[PDB]
Amino acid sequence: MQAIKCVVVGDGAVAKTCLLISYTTNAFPGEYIPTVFDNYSANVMVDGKPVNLGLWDTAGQEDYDRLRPLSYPQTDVFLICFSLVSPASFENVRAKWYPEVRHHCPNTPIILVGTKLDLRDDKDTIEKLKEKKLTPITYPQGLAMAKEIGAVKYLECSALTQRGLKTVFDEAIRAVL
Amino acid sequence: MQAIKCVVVGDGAVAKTCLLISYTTNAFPGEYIPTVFDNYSANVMVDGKPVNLGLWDTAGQEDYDRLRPLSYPQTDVFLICFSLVSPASFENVRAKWYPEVRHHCPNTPIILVGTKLDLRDDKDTIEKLKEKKLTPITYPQGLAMAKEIGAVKYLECSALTQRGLKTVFDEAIRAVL
Amino acid sequence: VYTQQELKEKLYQEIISYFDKGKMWEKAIKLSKELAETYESKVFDYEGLGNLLKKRASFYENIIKAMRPQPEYFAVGYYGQGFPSFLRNKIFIYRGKEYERREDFSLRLLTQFPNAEKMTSTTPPGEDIKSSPKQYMQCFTVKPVMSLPPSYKDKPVPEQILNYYRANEVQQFRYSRPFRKGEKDPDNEFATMWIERTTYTTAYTFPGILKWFEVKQISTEEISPLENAIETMELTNERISNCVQQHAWDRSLSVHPLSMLLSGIVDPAVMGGFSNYEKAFFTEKYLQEHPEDQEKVELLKRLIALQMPLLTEGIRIHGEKLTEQLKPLHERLSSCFRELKEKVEKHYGVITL
């Protein structure tokens, strides 16, 4: 049997936790059960043969930087994660989450995800962000960071409607494949 | 599996019938059961491996000469039989039973048996034969006929005490062997 | 001609062949027994017994040796009225395929009909659609109720037997409904959990004549957050036991699954369930929220306590697989494990064997 190793890192104001806890539980949109323990792995394949897969759930807290670096060694792919409708998330991406993680492992295929893809076109949240001088980073800027990092595919998924979430993990698995 | 074919021919005043019906029934001396049907075959070996054996019970009647000659063809050994304490038996042996049967099949190993071996030394039967000008043919005359016919062994058995009966059929079976 | 005997003989030979190539060996055995019995007690075709018992030996060897996937079970509500007389307003709990993805299955069931839309309120039906045209659909994956097989509750059966029963000879079904009931306090997401589970009975035993099968009886359930903690701990302990033994019965096995589970246990880094159960229950404020409903907590305590030595055995197998690569992982694992041993003993006030 063969396994898959991959990482999810980001802030705490975007809640990728819900995204992965609802991709693993197989659950319907809007009816996710939060669970106590982290490290959401799963036994699901998409292409070719069954394999073993995990999802390292990495904290957004700053103090936990001491414990994190040792997971990255001896991995297969990495899922660097950001949000499109959160500017503070983009700031943290350009400051910490893209540079340092890419710094520890500059040698591995990489994939990028775009969170809250339904509030990228929602007028009310966009309005409240404009009033807060906050910008929904559109697709071309994602492409810019993509060709800056050279990911095998810049993807954009969601959790209110699960649009392309399975597509995201499909591409992530087929990165080595 | 392999079989054995062999013949017993002689007069009717000596009763080789009892001899063979008591060798096949496995029975104790003096307690033989006569049976209706002739052709006493048996499933017994002595040496090497089990085999199939029969005993053609041949009539002493003269009329049945028409039916007899066809058994001899395609056989393995023959048991030409006579009696030591019957002179009429010896006369028939020198007239019919040695010459003609040896004539039909001059090409096969042959064995000779000596019947009533306990009346060859019984004084009362010998007396009654002397009074009837009848002779118990002793062993040297048997040897004479033996080296005249060239049998693989001239044997002498009995039925009141079964002396060497099993020896006789042992030699007869080991004739080809 | 075919008198009845040789007919069933041909029938059972073919049925065995089908079950054989179809990866359902429990039944293939169950029938090869009937064959052999009738052979050797009625017709004495001992060549038949020969090759038959040969085949049954192969059956048992396959059941233990290899391992086979678990089908995923969905539950399709063909809602509306624009549907035929036989699909109209009742749920077809489709057996699925080895690793089917709810998107793939709802896709095929889009292909199965015009009007490829989806519903949203997955728990209750839709009243406006309870007689409307423009055919409606809803697709969701559920969990198979474990059969409670006879003659297996007391022996320590190997895993293979149980995992193979884990999806077949199944008749009851269940799904998860997260209901929000409690204060939306800042960090504590677990203070509002309530589950009203879905009770589904399909009166035909999968697998059968058809993959799909309509539900027969549907019932509602209810789960309080204490009882939710109950099932969460039961499932956690069982997962740990299963991984422990399934690695105790193999050697060419990745160290990854146990690193996975033990890491999950040790560092609820994003969200911490231990202290959050604590904030919900262990305080006196919850005894003001529950004066007379208490012993659920003793269940939780003894279950985490029994998790502790099973966690210890997981650490033992971890050390059996520990290396310079696992050196820092087991370093932190031993650290927080000792801390948690002393925490449960002195800090908690709980008792364990």
Next chain:
Amino acid sequence: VYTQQELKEKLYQEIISYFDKGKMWEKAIKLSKELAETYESKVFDYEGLGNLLKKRASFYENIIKAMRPQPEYFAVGYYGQGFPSFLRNKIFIYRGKEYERREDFSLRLLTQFPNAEK
């Protein structure tokens, strides 16, 4: 140590082996059934069921396929009093051997004692 289970397991394996090589297959089957039953209902050693059912198939095939001789049965009367306390005046119906000849058997039982008469 040997708790009872693995002891009878060794015992029945040996008993089956003896009946096997000894050309009495009806009993060897009759016991391989008890083995397999206890395996698959108590310990689940399905490798055991595998090789066990294999062996039982061989058993049934042998019962029909080949053919084996019939022992000859004698009946010995150890008559008299100069005999021990356990052989004195009662008949020992010896099972024999595949094609034993009453002369051969009474010969061996001559060898078994002094005073070889009949």
